[PDB]
Amino acid sequence: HGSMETPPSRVYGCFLEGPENPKSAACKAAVAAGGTQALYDWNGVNQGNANGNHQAVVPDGQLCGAGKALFKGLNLARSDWPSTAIAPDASGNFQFVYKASAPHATRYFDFYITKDGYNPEKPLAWSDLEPAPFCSITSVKLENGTYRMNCPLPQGKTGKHVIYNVWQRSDSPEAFYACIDVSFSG
Numbered sequence: 001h002g003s004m005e006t007p008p009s010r011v012y013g014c015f016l017e018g019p020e021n022p023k024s025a026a027c028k029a030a031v032a033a034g035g036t037q038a039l040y041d042w043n044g045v046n047q048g049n050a051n052g053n054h055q056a057v058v059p060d061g062q063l064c065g066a067g068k069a070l071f072k073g074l075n076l077a078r079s080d081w082p083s084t085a086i087a088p089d090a091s092g093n094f095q096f097v098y099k100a101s102a103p104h105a106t107r108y109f110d111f112y113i114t115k116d117g118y119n120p121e122k123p124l125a126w127s128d129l130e131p132a133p134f135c136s137i138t139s140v141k142l143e144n145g146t147y148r149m150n151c152p153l154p155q156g157k158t159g160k161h162v163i164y165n166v167w168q169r170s171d172s173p174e175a176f177y178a179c180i181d182v183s184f185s186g
Ligand SMILES: [Cl-]
Pocket: 089, 090, 091
């Protein structure tokens, strides 16, 4: 269990607004569509039997909710999901921070990115992501309840995008999924 905290993932950002009084238009709409229970369970956007095959278990149009009815409100095809403007530091990497509320032996954290031109009014599909991840982390250390992971960012990517993070356990077939709304500078 967990989700991305740096930058905040889509589900965790809405939880942090306060499920009883969402502020952003998108988080209000998510609560209207699927209830507060999705936000209370922000750390549980999983598929139990992924086993490294995520397209088997996460349908197109439902990536951010991982194909789960509980999380359908995360799938709204809106341009206003709150985003974080990101850039690498002077090392050339960006430091992701994952809040690991139930730490587990890890096979990988994979990071996918939306294709150039992706229109957020289109429901998010796997084919809207480049087929190969831009960053694949196979070794993580638990530090203060988190994984701090250094990734290069996708080169030449501009504007508002979705990073789709996949955490595959190595001790279980279960995986966790975090859409992360970001923007890249020119
Ligand atoms: Cl720096």
